[PDB]
């Protein structure tokens, strides 16, 4: 099976030039790989940007250009804007199949480019504790504030509290004070939420999210379902 | 809830819809308001921050305003993909906490923009099964091949399956990872694409996208032009 490889992350200042590359494990990337570039802005669905090495989508700005350079596919952004912050995926055609690279997380220096990955679903008995993890991949973890929001089935959003990944200070929702603990691990870029003395009404999807300069949550984790039931497993 | 919003509202495609949120001096009155859009089983998505600012990628048809102790979300030129639950959120000074409205579920009642609306995602046990749907609009569905592409949390894109149009004998293709477990199909009379997912494994956990091809100039057709919003499929034993 062919493997497509990309830089995991890059940073560019507004107005700068950045070159993203896409390597094939089979040899030099050729026009016969019809290199495609797909853009995924923070919290958005992806959208095609470049196809057939250098063909622009109708919505692709002139500042983006696709090419081949030294055996790799290349995506060049000339005069980067804050709007260009995204995860960029390249895809190469190998006879009867598109193989995607792992993506390049491009941060535009200003709220950097990250993906949040939460731990799996949990089944708990009343009285037990649950510890949910939230790992950030991309721009420097300590630049972030992490907030926890939960949602019971068919109900509204509920703020649980938040923490700074820079200094570790917390603020918890009044209802949960003394039952909830939020922590971070700098070495692993992971935020943690522990909720103790679980009861039936704790059954919800638990989300972690980054915090804005404005206290708005731009990037969210996929959520973690916690089911609290008498029977348990 | 601290913030008050109507439980539901309906509107037609191409029309304008407004969603209002009522608070007090301690919250909306003196703090910046945010708006979130939420599709079923998936995470909220930031639409508006600082009362009226859009993050990049949020269409210009979404707008926000604040007047005294009330805030309003405006959606002009409604699209089928705008059918979602909308939440207002702000900081409450008297509580020293983030507060949310109860959410307004917007129902949106060929035409419009290219839209790929997904449903059917959810949480299932290993060995379970799910059926995903993609309702297409804004183009002649029966002339297009469609693809399913998935993205596991914090990971890259992986092609799943392809179905050609009627003009190419509805030819189907599958990634080796899903061969014999998944079935791609379509119902042209319903403008719908399906993904039947049987014998689910924990490694099938991902956001699943339906994708439609598009012209990239007059000499190339990218399979990856238009994408749906995605539907989350979680396959877990729940630590059992």
Author numbering:
A (entry chain H): 1 to 110, 117 to 239
B (entry chain L): 2 to 110, 116 to 246
Q: What text does the study give?
A:
Here we describe the discovery and development of a potent anti-P-cadherin/anti-CD3 bispecific DART protein, PF-06671008, capable of redirecting CD3-positive effector cells to kill P-cadherin expressing cells. In cancer, bsAbs that co-engage the CD3 epsilon subunit and a surface antigen on the tumor cell trigger T cell-mediated killing of the tumor cell while circumventing the need for the direct interaction of the TCR and MHC class I in complex with antigen. Oppositely charged coiled-coil sequences (E/K coils) were added at the carboxy terminus of each chain to drive heterodimerization.
Crystallographic studies of the DART protein were undertaken using a version of DART 35 lacking the E and K coils, replaced instead with poly-histidine and FLAG tags for purification purposes. The purified coil-less DART 35 demonstrated CTL-directed killing activity equivalent to that of the DART 35 construct containing the E and K coils. The crystal structure of the coil-less DART 35 protein was determined to 2.0 Å resolution. Missing amino acids in the linker regions were not modeled into the structure because of the lack of electron density, very likely due to disorder. The 2 Å resolution crystal structure of coil-less DART 35, arranged in the VL-VH format and separated by a 9-residue intra-chain linker on chain 1 (CD3VL-P-cadVH) and an 8-residue linker on chain 2 (PcadVL-CD3VH), shows that this DART construct assembles into a tightly packed spherical structure that differs considerably from the previously published diabody structures. In contrast, the DART 35 structure reported here shows that the disulfide bond formed between the two chains keeps the diabody in a compact configuration and reduces the distance between the two domains to 5.3 Å. The two antigen binding sites are separated from each other by approximately 30 Å and are facing away from each other at an angle of ~90°. The anti-CD3 CDR region is positioned remotely from the subunit interface, whereas the anti-P-cadherin CDR region lies adjacent to the interface. DART 35 and its optimized derivatives, 153 and 154, which are presumed to share the same epitope based on near-identical CDR sequences, show binding to all constructs that contain ECD3 but not to either ECD1-Fc or ECD1–2-Fc, suggesting that these DART proteins bind to human P-cadherin within ECD3.
